[PDB]
Short mmCIF file of C-alpha atoms and ligand atoms in Angstrom, two decimals:
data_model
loop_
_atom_site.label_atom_id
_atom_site.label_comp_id
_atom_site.label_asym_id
_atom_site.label_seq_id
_atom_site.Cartn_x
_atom_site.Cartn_y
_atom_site.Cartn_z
CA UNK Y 1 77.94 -35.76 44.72
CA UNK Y 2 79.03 -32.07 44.55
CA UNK Y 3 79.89 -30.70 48.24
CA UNK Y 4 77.65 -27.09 47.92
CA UNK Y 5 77.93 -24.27 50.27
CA UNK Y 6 76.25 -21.07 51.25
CA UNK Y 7 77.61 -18.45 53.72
CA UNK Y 8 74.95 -17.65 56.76
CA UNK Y 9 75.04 -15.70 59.90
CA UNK Y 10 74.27 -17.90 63.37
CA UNK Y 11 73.61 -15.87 66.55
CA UNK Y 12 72.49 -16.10 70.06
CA UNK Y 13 70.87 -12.25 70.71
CA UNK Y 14 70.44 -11.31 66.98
CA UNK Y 15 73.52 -8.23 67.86
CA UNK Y 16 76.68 -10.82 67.40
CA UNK Y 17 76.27 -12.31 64.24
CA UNK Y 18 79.17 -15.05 63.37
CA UNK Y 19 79.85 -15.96 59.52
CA UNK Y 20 79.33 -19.57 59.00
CA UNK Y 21 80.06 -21.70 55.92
CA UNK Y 22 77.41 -24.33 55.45
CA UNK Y 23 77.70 -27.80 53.60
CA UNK Y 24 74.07 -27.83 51.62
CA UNK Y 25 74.46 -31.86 51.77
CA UNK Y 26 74.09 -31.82 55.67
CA UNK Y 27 71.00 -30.77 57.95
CA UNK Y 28 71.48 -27.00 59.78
CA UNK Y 29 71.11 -29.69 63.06
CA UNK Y 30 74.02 -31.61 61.88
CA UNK Y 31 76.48 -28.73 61.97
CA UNK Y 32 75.25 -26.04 64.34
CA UNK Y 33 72.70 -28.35 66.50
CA UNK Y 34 69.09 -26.61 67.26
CA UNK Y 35 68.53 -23.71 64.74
CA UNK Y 36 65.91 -21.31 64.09
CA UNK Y 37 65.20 -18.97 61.39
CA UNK Y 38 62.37 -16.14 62.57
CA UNK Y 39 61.68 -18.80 65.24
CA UNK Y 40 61.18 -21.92 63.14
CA UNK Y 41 62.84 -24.85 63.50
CA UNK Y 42 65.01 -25.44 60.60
CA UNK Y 43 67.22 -28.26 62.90
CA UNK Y 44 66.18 -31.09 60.43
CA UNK Y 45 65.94 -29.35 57.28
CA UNK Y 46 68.72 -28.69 54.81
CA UNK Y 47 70.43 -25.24 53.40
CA UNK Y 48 67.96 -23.65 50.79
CA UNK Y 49 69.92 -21.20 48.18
CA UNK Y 50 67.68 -18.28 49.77
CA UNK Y 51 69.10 -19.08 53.13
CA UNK Y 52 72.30 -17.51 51.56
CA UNK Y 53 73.40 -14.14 54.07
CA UNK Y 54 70.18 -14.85 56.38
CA UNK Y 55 70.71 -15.19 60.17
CA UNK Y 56 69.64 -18.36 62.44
CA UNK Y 57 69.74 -18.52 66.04
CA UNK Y 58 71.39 -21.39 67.40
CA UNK Y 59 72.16 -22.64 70.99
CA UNK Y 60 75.29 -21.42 73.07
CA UNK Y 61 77.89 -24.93 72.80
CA UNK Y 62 81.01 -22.27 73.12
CA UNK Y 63 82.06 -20.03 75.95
CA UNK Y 64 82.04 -16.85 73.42
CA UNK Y 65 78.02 -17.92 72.64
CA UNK Y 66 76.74 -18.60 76.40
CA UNK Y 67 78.47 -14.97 77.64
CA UNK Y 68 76.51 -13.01 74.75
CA UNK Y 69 73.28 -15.19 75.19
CA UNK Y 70 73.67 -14.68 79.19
CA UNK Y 71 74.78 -10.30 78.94
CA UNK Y 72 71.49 -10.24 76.72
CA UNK Y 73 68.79 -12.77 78.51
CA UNK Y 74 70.23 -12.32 81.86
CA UNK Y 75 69.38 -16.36 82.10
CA UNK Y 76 71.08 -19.64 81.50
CA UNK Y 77 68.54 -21.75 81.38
CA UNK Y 78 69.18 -24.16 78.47
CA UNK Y 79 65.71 -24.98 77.10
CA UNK Y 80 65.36 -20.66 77.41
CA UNK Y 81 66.44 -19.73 73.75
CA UNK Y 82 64.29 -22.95 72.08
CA UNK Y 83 61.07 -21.67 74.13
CA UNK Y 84 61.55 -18.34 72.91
CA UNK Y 85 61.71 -19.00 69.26
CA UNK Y 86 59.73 -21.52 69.16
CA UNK Y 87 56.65 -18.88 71.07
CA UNK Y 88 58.14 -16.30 68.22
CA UNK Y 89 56.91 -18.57 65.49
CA UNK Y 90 53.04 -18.39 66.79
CA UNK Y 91 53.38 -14.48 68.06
CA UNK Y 92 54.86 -13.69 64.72
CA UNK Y 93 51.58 -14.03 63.27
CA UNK Y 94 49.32 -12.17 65.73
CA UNK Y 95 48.27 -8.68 64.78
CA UNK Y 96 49.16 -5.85 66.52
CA UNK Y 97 46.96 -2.81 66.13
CA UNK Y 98 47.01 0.43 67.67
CA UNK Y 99 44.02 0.59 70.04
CA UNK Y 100 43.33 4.34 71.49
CA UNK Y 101 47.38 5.36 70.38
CA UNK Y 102 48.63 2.10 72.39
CA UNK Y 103 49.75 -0.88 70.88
CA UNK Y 104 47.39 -4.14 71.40
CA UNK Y 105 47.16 -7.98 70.37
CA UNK Y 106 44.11 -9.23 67.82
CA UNK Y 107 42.90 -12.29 70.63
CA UNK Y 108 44.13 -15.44 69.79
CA UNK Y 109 45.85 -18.41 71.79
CA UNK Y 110 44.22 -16.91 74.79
CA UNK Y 111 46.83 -13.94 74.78
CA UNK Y 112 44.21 -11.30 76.48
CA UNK Y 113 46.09 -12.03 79.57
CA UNK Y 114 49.47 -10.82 77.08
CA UNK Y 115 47.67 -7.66 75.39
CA UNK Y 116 46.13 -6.58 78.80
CA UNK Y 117 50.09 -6.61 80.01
CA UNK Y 118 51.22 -5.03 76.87
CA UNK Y 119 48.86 -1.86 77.00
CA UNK Y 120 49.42 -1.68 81.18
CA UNK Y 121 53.47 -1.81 80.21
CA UNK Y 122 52.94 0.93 77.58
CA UNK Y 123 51.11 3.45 80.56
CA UNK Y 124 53.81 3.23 83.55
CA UNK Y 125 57.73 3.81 84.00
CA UNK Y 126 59.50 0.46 83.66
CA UNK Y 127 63.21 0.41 82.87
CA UNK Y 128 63.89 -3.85 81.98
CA UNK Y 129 67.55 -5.12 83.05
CA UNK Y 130 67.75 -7.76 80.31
CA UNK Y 131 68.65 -6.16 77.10
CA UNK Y 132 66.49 -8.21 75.32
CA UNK Y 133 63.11 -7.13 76.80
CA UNK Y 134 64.49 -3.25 77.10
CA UNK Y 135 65.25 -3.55 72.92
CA UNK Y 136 61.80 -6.02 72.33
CA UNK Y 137 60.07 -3.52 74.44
CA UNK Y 138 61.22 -0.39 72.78
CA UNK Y 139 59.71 -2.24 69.68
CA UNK Y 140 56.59 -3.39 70.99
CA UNK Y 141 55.88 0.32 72.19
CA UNK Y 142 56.13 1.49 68.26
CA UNK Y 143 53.86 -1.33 67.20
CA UNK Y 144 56.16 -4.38 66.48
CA UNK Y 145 55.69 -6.73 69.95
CA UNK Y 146 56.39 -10.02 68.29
CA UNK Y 147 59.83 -10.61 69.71
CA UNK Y 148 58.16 -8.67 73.38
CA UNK Y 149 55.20 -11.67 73.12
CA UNK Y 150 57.57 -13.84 72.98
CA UNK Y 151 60.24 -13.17 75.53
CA UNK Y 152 57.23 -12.48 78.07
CA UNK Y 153 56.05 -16.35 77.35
CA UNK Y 154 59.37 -17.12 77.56
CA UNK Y 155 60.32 -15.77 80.91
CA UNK Y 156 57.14 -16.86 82.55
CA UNK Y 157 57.42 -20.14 81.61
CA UNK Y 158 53.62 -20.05 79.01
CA UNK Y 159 52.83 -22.44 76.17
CA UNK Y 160 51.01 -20.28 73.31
CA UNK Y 161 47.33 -21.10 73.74
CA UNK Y 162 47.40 -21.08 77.58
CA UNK Y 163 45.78 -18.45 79.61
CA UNK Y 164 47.75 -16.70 82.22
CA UNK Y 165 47.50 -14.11 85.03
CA UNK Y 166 48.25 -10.80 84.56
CA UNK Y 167 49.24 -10.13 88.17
CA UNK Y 168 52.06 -13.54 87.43
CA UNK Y 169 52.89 -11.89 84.85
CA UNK Y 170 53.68 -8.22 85.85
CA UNK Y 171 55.37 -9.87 89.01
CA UNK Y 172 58.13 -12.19 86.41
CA UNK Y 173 58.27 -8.75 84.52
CA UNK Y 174 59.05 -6.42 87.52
CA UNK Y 175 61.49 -8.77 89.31
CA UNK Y 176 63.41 -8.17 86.04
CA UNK Y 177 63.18 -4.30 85.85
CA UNK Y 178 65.23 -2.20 88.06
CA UNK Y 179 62.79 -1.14 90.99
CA UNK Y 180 65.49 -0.53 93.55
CA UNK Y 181 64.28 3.15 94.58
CA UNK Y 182 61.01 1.69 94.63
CA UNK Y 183 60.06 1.72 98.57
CA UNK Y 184 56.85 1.36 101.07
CA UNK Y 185 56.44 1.82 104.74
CA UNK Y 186 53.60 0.21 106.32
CA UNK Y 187 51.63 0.37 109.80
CA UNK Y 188 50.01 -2.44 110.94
CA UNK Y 189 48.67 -1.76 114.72
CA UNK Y 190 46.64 -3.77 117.06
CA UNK Y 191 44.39 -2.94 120.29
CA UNK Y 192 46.75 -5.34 122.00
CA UNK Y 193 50.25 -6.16 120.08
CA UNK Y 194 50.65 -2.07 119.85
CA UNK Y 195 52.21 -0.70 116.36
CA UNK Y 196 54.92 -2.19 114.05
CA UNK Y 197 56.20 -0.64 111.46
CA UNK Y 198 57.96 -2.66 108.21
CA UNK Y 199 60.10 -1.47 105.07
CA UNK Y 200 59.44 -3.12 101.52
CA UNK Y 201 61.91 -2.86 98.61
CA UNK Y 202 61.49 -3.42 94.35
CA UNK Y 203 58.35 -5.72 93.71
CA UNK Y 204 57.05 -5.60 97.06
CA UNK Y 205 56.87 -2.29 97.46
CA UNK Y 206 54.70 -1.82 94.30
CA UNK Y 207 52.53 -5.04 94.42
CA UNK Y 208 49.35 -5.67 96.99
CA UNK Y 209 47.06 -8.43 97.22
CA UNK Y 210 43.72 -8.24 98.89
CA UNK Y 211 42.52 -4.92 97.92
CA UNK Y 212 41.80 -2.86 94.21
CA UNK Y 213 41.74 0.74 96.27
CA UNK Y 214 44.84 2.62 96.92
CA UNK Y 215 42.37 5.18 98.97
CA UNK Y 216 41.68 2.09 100.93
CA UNK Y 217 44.99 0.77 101.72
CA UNK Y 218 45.62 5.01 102.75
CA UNK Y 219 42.60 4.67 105.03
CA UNK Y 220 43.55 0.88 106.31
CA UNK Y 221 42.48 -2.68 106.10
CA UNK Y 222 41.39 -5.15 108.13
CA UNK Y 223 44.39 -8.26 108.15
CA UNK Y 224 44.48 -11.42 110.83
CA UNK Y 225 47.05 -10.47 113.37
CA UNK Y 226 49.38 -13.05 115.13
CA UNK Y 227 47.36 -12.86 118.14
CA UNK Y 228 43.99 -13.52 116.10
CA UNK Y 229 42.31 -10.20 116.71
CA UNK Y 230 41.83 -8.20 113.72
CA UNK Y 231 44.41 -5.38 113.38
CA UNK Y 232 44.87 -2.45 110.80
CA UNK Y 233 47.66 -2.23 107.93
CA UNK Y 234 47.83 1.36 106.61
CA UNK Y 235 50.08 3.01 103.97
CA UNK Y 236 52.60 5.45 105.94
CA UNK Y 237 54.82 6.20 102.93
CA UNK Y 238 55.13 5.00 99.38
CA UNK Y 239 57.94 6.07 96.77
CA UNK Y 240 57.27 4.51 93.57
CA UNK Y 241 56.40 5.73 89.79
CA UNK Y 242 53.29 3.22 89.88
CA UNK Y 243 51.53 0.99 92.59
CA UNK Y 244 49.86 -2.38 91.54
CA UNK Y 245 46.39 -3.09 93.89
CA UNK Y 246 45.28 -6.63 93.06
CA UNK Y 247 42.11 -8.89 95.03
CA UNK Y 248 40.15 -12.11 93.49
CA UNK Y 249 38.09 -10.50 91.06
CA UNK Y 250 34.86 -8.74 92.34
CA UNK Y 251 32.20 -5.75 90.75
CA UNK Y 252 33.85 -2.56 91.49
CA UNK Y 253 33.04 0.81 90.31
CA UNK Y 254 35.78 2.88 88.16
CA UNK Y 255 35.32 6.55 87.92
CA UNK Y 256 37.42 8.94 85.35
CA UNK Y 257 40.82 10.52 86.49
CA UNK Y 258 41.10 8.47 89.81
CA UNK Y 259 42.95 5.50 88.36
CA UNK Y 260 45.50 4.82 85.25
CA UNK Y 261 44.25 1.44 84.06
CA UNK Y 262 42.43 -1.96 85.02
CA UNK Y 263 42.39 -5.54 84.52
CA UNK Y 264 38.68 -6.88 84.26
CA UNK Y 265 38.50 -10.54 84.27
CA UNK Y 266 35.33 -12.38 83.84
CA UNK Y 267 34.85 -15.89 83.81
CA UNK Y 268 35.77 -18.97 86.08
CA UNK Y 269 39.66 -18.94 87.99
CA UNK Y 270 42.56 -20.17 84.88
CA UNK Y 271 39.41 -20.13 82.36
CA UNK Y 272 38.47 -16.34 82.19
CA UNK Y 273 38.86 -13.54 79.65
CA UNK Y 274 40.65 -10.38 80.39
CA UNK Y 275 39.68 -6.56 79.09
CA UNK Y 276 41.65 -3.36 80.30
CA UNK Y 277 40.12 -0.37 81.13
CA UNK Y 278 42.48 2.65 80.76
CA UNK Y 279 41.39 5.98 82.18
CA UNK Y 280 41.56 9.18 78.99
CA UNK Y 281 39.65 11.90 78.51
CA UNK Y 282 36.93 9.14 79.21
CA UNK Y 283 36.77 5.01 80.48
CA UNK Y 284 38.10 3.62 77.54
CA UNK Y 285 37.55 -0.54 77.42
CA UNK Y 286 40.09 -2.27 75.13
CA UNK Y 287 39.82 -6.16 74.26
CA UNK Y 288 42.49 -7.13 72.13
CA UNK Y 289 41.38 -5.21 68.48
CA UNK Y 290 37.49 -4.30 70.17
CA UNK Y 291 37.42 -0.33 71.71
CA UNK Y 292 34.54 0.25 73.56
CA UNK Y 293 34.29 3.81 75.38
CA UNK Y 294 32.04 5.25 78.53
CA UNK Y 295 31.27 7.79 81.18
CA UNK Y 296 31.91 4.92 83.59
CA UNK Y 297 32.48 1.58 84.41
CA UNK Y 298 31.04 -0.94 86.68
CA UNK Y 299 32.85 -4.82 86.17
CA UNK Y 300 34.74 -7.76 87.48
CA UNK Y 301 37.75 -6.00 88.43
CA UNK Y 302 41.11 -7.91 89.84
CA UNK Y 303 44.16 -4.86 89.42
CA UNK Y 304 44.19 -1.52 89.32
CA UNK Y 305 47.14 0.70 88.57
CA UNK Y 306 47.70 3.75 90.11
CA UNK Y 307 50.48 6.66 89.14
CA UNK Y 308 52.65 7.68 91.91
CA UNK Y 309 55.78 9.64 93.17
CA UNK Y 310 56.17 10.22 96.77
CA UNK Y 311 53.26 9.58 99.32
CA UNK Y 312 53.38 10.49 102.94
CA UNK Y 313 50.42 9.72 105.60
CA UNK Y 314 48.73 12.56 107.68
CA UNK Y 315 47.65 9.45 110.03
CA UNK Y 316 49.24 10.20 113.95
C1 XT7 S 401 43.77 -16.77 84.36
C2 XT7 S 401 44.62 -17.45 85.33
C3 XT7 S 401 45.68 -18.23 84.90
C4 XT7 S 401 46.53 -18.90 85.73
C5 XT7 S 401 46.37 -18.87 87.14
N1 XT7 S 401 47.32 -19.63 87.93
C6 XT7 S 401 47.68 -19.61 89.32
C7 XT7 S 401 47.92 -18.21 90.00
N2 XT7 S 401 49.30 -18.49 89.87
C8 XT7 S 401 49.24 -19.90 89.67
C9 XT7 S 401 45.26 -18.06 87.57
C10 XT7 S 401 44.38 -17.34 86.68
C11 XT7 S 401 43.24 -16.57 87.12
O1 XT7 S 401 42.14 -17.10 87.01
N3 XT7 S 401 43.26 -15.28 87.62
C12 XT7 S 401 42.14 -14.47 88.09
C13 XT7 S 401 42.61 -12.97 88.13
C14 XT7 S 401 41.60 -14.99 89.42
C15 XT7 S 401 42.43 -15.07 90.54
C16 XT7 S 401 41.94 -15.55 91.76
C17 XT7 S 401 40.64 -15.99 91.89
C18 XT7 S 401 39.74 -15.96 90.79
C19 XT7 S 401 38.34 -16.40 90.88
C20 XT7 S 401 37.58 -17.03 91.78
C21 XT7 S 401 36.19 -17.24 91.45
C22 XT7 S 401 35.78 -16.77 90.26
C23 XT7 S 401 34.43 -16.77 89.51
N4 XT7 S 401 33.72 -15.43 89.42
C24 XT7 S 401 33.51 -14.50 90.61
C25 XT7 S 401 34.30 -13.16 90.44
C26 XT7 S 401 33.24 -12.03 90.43
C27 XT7 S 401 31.99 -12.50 91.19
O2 XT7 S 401 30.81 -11.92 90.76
C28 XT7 S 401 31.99 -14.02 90.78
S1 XT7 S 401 37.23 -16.02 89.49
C29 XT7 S 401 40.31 -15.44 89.60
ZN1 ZN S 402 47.70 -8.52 117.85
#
């Protein structure tokens, strides 16, 4: 029969597009292997006449395709760009409205745990090394977080329709964000073992599990020493644009102005439902598309995110 072709563009980042003649007899699959157009998998199906001048994303199988894919996703893991587009398909068709002049997700396929990320992303300094989530990011912040959604599930390593943790989540995002002025001094003394003193760099010195109040961790906390006597961890010095408190969720009260935003999370451990609480002109509550607004707030809280630029103890 007649040999048909169409001209198309195949890419690995969406910035490098390569002209490619296709045969309209054969299957994308046949000729480029695994290809996606806007995410779906178009591997099996054959060359429509609209197709002609579109772009499809196709796996690296040449040198010139693996260096662009690994410059822009700072990853070579091989199932990486399949995951991707195939999450793009689903977060595609969420909604994205603005929510209190911050972009949110409409809740479906359990992606509270994603919106409550999105709107915490959009309120504290975060520069991305991959140039894929600094360019999906730039877009998500204007309103379009499809290809964001996406790369997020990606990275971490989510199926669409699983819930995840926020605090996982931030943690996969920051260790690819350049924190490397990010540091914390800490103080942890004993009655016995005397005082030692420890330097944290990127994540770790903006991450802290086992209490929501940054006052708190000022003041000290109560941690099992080596010895088995209780001894004291205090803050001495923190240099950071942002410091993440976490604990297991518990009722804590959040009052105006002391705080920049929350993660609420009620319901059983992997099973839950998030809500962030972001701190305006009043407690604003936003869950996915719902706004809810009050004078205060009393909930199952599990982080809190506090602004920050240099921090030095008065302690000794
Ligand atoms: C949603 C989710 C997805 C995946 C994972 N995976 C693992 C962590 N990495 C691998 C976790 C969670 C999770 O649920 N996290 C919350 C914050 C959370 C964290 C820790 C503990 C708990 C809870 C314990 C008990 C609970 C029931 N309700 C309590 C809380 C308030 C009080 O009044 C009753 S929730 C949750
Ligand atoms: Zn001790």
């Amino acid at each position: 029969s007649e040999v048909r072709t169409i001209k198309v563009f195949t890419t690995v980042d969406n910035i490098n597009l390569h002209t490619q003649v296709v045969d309209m007899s054969m299957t994308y699959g046949q000729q480029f292997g695994p290809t996606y157009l806007d995410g779906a998998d178009v591997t099996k199906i054959k060359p429509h006449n609209s197709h002609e001048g579109k772009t499809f994303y196709v796996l690296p199988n040449d040198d010139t395709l693996r260096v662009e894919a690994f410059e822009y996703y700072h990853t070579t893991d091989p199932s990486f760009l399949g995951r991707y587009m195939s999450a793009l398909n689903h977060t595609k068709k969420w909604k994205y409205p603005q929510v209190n002049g911050l972009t949110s997700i409409k809740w479906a396929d359990n992606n509270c745990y994603l919106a409550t990320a999105l709107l915490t992303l959009q309120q504290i300094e975060l520069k991305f090394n991959p140039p894929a989530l600094q360019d999906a990011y730039y877009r998500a912040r204007a309103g379009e977080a499809a290809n964001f959604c996406a790369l997020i599930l990606a990275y971490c390593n989510k199926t669409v329709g699983e819930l995840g943790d926020v605090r996982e989540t931030m943690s996969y995002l920051f260790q690819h964000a350049n924190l490397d002025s990010c540091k914390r001094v800490l103080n942890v003394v004993c009655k016995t073992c005397g005082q030692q003193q420890t330097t944290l760099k990127g994540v770790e010195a903006v991450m802290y599990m086992g209490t929501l109040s940054y006052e708190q961790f000022k003041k000290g906390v109560q941690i099992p020493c080596t010895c088995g006597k209780q001894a004291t961890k205090y803050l001495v010095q923190q240099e950071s644009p942002f410091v993440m408190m976490s604990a297991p969720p518990a009722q804590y009260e959040l009052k105006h102005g002391t705080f920049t935003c929350a993660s609420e999370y009620t319901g059983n451990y992997q099973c839950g439902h998030y809500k962030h609480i972001t701190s305006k002109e009043t407690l604003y509550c936003i869950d996915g598309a719902l706004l809810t607004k009050s004078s205060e707030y009393k909930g199952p809280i599990t982080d809190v995110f506090y602004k920050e630029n240099s921090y030095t103890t008065t302690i000794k």
